[PDB]
Amino acid sequence: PELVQAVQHVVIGPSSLIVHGCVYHGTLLDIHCAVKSLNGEVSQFLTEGIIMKDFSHPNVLSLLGICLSPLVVLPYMKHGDLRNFIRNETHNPTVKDLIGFGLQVAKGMKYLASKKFVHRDLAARNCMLDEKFTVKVADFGLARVPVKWMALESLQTQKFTTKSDVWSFGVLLWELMTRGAPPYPDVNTFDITVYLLQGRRLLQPEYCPDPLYEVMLKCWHPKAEMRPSFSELVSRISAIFSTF
Numbered sequence: 062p063e064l065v066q067a068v069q070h071v072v073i074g075p076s077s078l079i080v081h082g083c084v085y086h087g088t089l090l091d092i093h094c095a096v097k098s099l100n101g102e103v104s105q106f107l108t109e110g111i112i113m114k115d116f117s118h119p120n121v122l123s124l125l126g127i128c129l130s131p132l133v134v135l136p137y138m139k140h141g142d143l144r145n146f147i148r149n150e151t152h153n154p155t156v157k158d159l160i161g162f163g164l165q166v167a168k169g170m171k172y173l174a175s176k177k178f179v180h181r182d183l184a185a186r187n188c189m190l191d192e193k194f195t196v197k198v199a200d201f202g203l204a205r206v207p208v209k210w211m212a213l214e215s216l217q218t219q220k221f222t223t224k225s226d227v228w229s230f231g232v233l234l235w236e237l238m239t240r241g242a243p244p245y246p247d248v249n250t251f252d253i254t255v256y257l258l259q260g261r262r263l264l265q266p267e268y269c270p271d272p273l274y275e276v277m278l279k280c281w282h283p284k285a286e287m288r289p290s291f292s293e294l295v296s297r298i299s300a301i302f303s304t305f
């Protein structure tokens with residue numbers, strides 16, 4: 062009804078999209094795009110469109126538009142996801158370049174948080190890279206419609222907030238400083254809640270600066286309230302990057 066009218070500015074007409082679930086290459090008119098096919102719930106998908114169409118930040122993947130299986134049209138990202146990029150042979154980003162990637166994630170997340178957007182699945186596998194190696198926060202498989210990245214309160218209560226996203230970002234920083242290493246590889250899926258309650262945490266990566274590892278430890282506080290906001294994380298990571 063009114064949702065139907067509110068999504069008109071995000072709806073793309075079939076005479077403007079050429080598709081060539083999963084992601085397929087496609088062309089858009091208003092240009093090269095990525096089109097994900099989505100194999101009650103349609104109502105929640107439409108409100109997401111209204112929200113994500115408002116997005117305009119250099120570190121956030123933009124939503125070009127939506128199709129009526131429903132399709133999602135996103136800008137094409139040449140170097141794919143961040144996690145696979147830091148594990149690829151052809152790319153050798155320095156430790157300063159990895160810190161820089163993390164800062165771009167923090168600024169895009171600062172933007173998402175300024176707009177009251179709780180990501181729910183922040184991980185390096187969900188951040189894309191474009192042709193200029195700009196890191197763009199994205200979701201490659203529905204989250205608002207991954208236990209080794211979830212906050213303690215999310216594991217126990219199933220509640221997701223911006224402070225629980227800060228916890229996921231701490232794990233994302235670890236992934237970057239380890240170059241795509243699986244967090245908690247010897248901790249069962251069914252054992253992390255007790256492991257985290259007992260105080261235990263991920264250890265300092267070999268090539269991680271001491272102030273940057275303190276930042277990861279701040280994101281992993283048992284109290285969500287005691288965790289640094291995204292604005293604070295941008296401030297602290299910019300400070301580290303400038304003096305590294």
Ligand SMILES: C[C@@H](c1ccccc1)n1cc(-c2cc(F)cc(F)c2)c(=O)[nH]c1=O
Nearest residue numbers: 106109110113122123124127133198199200
């Ligand atoms: C815009 C981008 C994103 C996601 C999170 C944070 C920032 C940016 N994005 C949006 C959707 C999406 C779009 C919709 F219109 C409805 C929906 F259900 C999902 C998606 O599947 N993947 C993805 O990367």
